[PDB]
Design a binder for this molecule. Sequence first.
Ligand SMILES: Nc1ncnc2c1ncn2[C@@H]1O[C@H](COP(=O)(O)OP(=O)(O)O)[C@@H](O)[C@H]1O
Length: 415
Amino acid sequence: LSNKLTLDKLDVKGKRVVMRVDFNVPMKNNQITNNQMIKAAVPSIKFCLDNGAKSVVLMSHLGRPDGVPMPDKYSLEPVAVELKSLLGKDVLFLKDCVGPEVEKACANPAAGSVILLENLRFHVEEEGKGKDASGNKVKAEPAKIEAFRASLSKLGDVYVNDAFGTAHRAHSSMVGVNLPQKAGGFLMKKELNYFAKALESPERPFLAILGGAKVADKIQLINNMLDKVNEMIIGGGMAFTFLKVLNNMEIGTSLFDEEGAKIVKDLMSKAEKNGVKITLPVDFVTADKFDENAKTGQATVASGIPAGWMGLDCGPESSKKYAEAVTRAKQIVWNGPVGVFEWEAFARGTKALMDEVVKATSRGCITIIGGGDTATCCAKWNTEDKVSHVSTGGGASLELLEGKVLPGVDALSNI
Ligand SMILES: Nc1ncnc2c1ncn2[C@@H]1O[C@H](COP(=O)(O)OP(=O)(O)O)[C@@H](O)[C@H]1O
């Protein structure tokens, strides 16, 4: 991860820059409800402009068109408008992202042109698959995927990828742009710096906080983290599988991963061999059903959860034990809330934990927040600036934590 060319080292003078960005912003009726994702890209674009780029060609996706043109539903046009404001400068919107018209527009544009192409996932060749009118799955054609990729490549002299949250997929805009320099943008650079350090040479003690719902789909996540951490909190729905298996806890109607249950002792076994201290919750906020407005109660590992009730958050004693581990940590990676954060009644455990993680940052702890749900919590409670790094990609950060090679990152130029 440390070895990749980045925009700041990329000579852009006189050069057409084709830049993959993440402009998948929240929307209601083709009006942008939060422009944060667009503003995050501005530094990369403005850098190209300020250093004499002939053009910047922006490409991205939005919504779920699924390989079909939906310009009434998932057009990037509104985003071109918003971008005009943010840059203080015209953005040319083109109605497609490939083909002879688009290539002609991009071939030798007026010096300093900013161009936004239309949604990449209007074409089946981006993701390599999609759906038709009736919702039947359809596959893309190999020769067409090739031509789509060659068309994207014509649009610039150099390539910048600043869409970390898509770099876990081998999509055409991630891996298909064949130019002699392919560099990470300023957002990508951040992602690579933080996760490279945490995976290759973290501060010690290194704590991982892993939350979620099921166990069986995080074996490799847990396995790879146990190769590298000094401590690991387990929370969220996951924990009840560990507790039933390890302590014969009665869990009522709480999530139970029947498959995951059978490898729990194997995971602890590995932790023991490596000297990883595992901190599991010891008490819970319970709900009579999986509903935002369910009746609430309280339970401990000792009491167990009564029949017909489920544990949707940790309780105050668990919060302390989590806090003891956070206090010891010099580096933290947090991927996954420890309760049903979406519903206020079961968000306290995650909010409290978030406060401890903020306080740790103040004292010099390195704190990395995974994308997806953990980063939503940071947005929702105004702590994006109070941790060291909030990741911009859920699936992407998770695959890095699993120890995988990300196609989009791997395709970047070295040194
Ligand atoms: N105790 C719990 N019971 C049920 N769901 C939980 C609990 N704690 C957290 N969650 C939920 O887990 C979800 C995140 O699950 P996810 O990260 O997708 O795990 P998985 O990939 O195993 O489904 C969140 O929507 C959150 O509301």
